[PDB]
Coordinates of C-alpha atoms and ligand atoms in Angstrom, one line a residue:
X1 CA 13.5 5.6 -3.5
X2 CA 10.7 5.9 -5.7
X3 CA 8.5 8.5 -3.2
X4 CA 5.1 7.1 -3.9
X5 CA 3.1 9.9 -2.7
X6 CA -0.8 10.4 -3.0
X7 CA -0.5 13.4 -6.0
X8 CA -4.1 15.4 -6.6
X9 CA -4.0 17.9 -10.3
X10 CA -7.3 19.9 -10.2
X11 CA -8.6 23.2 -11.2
X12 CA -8.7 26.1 -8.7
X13 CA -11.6 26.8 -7.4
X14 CA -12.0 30.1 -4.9
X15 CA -11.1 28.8 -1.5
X16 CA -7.6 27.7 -2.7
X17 CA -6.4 31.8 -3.3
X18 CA -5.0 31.8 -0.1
X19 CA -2.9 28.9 -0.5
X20 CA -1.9 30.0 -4.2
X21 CA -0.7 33.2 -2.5
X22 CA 1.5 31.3 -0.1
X23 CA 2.9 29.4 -2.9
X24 CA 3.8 32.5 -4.7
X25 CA 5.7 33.7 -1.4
X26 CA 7.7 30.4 -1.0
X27 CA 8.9 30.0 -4.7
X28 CA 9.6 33.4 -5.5
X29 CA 11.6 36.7 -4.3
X30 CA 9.7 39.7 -3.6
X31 CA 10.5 41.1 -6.8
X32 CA 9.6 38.0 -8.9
X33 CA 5.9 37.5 -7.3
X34 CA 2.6 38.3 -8.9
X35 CA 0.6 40.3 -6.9
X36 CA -2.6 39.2 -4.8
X37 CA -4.9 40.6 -7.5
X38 CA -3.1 38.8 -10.3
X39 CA -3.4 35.1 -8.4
X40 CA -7.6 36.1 -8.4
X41 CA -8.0 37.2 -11.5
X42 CA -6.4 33.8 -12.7
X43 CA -8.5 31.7 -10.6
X44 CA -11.6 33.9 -10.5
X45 CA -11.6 34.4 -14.9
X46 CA -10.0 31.4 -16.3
X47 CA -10.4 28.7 -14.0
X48 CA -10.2 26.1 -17.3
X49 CA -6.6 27.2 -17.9
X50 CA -5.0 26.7 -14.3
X51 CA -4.1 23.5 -12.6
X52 CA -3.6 23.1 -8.7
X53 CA -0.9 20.3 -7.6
X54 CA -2.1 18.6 -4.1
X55 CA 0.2 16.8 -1.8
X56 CA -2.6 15.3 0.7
X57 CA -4.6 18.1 1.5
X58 CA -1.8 20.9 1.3
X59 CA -1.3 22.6 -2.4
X60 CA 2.4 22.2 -3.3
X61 CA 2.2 22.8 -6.9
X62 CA 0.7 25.2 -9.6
X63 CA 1.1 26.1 -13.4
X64 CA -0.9 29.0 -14.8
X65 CA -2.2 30.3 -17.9
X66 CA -4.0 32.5 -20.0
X67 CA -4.9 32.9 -24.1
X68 CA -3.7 35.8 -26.0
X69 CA -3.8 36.3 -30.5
X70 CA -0.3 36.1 -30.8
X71 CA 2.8 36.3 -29.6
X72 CA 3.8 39.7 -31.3
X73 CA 1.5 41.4 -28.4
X74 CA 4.1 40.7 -25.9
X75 CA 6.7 43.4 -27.3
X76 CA 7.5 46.2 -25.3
X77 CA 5.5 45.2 -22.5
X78 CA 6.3 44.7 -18.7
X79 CA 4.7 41.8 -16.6
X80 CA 2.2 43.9 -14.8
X81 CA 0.4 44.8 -18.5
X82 CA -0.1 40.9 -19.1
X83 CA -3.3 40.1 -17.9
X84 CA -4.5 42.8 -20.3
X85 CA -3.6 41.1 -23.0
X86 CA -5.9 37.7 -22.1
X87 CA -9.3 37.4 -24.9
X88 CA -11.6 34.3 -24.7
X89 CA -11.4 33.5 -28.0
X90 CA -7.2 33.8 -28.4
X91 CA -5.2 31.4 -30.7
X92 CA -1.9 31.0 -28.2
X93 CA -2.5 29.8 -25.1
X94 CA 0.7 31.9 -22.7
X95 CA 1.9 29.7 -20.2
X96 CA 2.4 32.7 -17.4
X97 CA 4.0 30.6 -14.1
X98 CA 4.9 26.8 -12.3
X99 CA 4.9 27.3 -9.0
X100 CA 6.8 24.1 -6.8
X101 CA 7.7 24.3 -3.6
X102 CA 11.0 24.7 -3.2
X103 CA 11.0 21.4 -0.2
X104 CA 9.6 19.3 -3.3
X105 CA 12.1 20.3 -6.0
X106 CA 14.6 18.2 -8.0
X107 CA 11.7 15.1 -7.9
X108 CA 10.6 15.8 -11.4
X109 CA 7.3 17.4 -10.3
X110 CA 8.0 20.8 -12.7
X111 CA 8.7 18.2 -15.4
X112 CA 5.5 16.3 -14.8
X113 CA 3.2 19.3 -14.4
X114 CA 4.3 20.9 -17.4
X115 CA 4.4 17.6 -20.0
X116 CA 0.3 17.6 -18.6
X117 CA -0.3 21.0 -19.8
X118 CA 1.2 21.1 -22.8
X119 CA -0.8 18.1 -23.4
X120 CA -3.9 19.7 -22.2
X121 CA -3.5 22.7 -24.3
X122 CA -2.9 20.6 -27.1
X123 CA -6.7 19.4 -26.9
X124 CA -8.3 22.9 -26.4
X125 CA -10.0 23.7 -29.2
X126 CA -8.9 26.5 -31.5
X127 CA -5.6 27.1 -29.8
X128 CA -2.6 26.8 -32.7
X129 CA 0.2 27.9 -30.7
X130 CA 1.7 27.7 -27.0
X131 CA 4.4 30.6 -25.5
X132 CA 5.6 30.8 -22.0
X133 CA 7.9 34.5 -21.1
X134 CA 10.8 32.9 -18.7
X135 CA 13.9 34.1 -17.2
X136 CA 17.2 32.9 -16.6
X137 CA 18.4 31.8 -13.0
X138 CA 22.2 32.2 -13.4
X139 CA 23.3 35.0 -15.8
X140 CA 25.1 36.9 -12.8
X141 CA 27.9 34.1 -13.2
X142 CA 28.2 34.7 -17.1
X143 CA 27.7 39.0 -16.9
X144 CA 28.9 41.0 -18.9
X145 CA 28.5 38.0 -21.6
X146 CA 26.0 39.4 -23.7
X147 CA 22.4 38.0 -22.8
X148 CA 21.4 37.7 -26.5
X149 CA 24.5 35.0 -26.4
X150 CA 24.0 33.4 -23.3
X151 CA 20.5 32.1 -23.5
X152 CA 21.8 29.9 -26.9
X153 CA 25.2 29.0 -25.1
X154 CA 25.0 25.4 -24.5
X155 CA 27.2 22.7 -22.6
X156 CA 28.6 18.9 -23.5
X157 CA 25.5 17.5 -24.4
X158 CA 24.2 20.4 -26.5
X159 CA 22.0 21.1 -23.7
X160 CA 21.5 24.8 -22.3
X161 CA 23.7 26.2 -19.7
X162 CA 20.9 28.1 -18.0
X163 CA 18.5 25.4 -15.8
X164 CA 15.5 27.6 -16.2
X165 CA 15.9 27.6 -20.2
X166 CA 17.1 24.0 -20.7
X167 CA 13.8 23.3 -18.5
X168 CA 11.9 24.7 -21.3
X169 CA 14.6 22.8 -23.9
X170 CA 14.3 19.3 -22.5
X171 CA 10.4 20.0 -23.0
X172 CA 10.9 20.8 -26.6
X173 CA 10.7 24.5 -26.5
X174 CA 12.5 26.4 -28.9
X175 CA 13.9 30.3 -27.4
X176 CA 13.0 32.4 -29.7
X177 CA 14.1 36.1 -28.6
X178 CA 14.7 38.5 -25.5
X179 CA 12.2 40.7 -24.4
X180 CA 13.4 43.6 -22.7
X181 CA 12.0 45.7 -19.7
X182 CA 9.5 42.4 -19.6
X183 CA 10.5 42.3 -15.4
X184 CA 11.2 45.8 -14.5
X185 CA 12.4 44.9 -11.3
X186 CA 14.3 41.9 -12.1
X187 CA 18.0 43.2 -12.0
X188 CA 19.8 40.2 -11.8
X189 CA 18.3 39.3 -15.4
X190 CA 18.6 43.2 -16.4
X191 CA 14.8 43.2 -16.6
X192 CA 14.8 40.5 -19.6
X193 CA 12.4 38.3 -19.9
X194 CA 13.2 35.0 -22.4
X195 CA 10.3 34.3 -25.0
X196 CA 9.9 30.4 -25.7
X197 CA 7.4 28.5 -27.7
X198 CA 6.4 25.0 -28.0
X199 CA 4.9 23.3 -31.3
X200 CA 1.8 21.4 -30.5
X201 CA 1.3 20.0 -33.8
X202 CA 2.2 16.3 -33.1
X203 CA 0.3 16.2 -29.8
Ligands
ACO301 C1 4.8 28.8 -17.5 C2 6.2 29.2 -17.5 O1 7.1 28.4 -17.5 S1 6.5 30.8 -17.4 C3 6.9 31.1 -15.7 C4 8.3 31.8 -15.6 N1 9.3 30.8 -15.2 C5 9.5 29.7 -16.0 O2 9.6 29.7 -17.2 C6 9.6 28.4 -15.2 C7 10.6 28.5 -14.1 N2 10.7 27.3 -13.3 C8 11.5 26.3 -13.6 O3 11.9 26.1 -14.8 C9 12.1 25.5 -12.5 O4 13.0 24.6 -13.1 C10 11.0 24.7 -11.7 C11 10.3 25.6 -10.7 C12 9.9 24.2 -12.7 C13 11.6 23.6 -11.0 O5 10.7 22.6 -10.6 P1 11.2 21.1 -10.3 O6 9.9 20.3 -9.8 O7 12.4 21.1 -9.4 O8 11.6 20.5 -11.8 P2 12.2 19.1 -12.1 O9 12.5 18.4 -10.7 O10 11.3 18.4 -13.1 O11 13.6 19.4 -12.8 C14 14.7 20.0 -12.1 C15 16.0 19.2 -12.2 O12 15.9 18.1 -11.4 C16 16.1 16.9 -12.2 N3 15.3 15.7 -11.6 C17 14.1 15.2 -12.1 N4 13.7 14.2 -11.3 C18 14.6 14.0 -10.3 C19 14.8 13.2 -9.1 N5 13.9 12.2 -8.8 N6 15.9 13.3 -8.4 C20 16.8 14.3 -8.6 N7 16.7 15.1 -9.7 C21 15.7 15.1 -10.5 C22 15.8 17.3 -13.6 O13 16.4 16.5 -14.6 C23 16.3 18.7 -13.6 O14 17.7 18.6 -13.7 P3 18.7 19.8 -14.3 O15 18.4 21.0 -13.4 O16 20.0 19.2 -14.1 O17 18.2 19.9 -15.8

């Protein structure tokens, strides 16, 4: 059935950090979360360039971001040196996390929350450009297939085999390169972090 459920998309404000760090806990393995810190800082700094998904009065739903010169700045760096890399004025807006809890999955909430933000980075001013760093959820099936191969190897349908990087695909993202030792502690994905990016120029 269609769900009709009462859906709220706002801006964090302060008082929502302790559900954000829930959220974090729920969707994510220890090794995959941001830390405490990292959830404020977005909230606290860039408010504009978060949005916070409300089912009723419970937060189910988050996509975060920040604004960086270019995308060059993100070789050779791990996860934790990010939010370092954030300036006011920055051309390409880095899509950092979505955040959906796991209960709510499979309802085309990811799909929905990110379509909004491209859309809303599109209308920023000044911003050329928009990058998100992802991972893949199922190279342990295709190892020791070469990563560099398996984030272009497709299926029937031409769409990609991995369902973390056809999410980006069906979106219009084009994967552009691996970046090693992105997620130190991400062995399943031998630290590799995926770089996408999306062309705004139409929207
Ligand atoms: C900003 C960044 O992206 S960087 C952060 C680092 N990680 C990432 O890059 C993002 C990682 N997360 C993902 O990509 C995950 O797919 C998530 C967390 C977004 C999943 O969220 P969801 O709300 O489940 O996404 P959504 O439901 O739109 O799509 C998942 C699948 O369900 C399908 N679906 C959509 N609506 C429905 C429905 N009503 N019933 C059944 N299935 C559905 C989609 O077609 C998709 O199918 P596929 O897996 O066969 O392609």
């Amino acid at each position: 059935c269609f769900e009709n459920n009462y859906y709220n998309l706002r801006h964090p404000k302060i008082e929502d950090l302790r559900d954000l760090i829930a959220l974090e806990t729920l969707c994510w393995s220890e090794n995959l979360q941001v830390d405490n810190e990292e959830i404020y800082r977005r909230i606290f700094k860039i408010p504009q360039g978060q949005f916070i998904l409300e089912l009723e009065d419970k937060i189910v739903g988050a996509i975060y971001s920040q604004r960086i010169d270019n995308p060059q700045l993100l070789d050779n760096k791990t996860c934790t040196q990010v939010p370092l890399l954030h300036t006011e004025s920055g051309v390409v807006v880095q899509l950092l996390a979505v955040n959906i809890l796991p209960e709510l999955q499979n309802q085309g909430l990811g799909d929905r929350l990110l379509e909004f933000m491209l859309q809303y980075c599109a209308q920023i001013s000044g911003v050329e450009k928009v990058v998100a760093v992802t991972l893949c959820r199922n190279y342990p099936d295709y190892s020791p297939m070469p990563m560099a191969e398996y984030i272009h190897q497709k299926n029937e349908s031409g769409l990609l085999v991995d369902p973390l990087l056809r999410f980006h695909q069906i979106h219009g993202a084009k994967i552009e390169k691996l970046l090693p030792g992105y997620r130190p502690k991400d062995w399943e994905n031998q630290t590799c972090g995926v770089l996408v990016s999306y062309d705004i120029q139409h929207r």
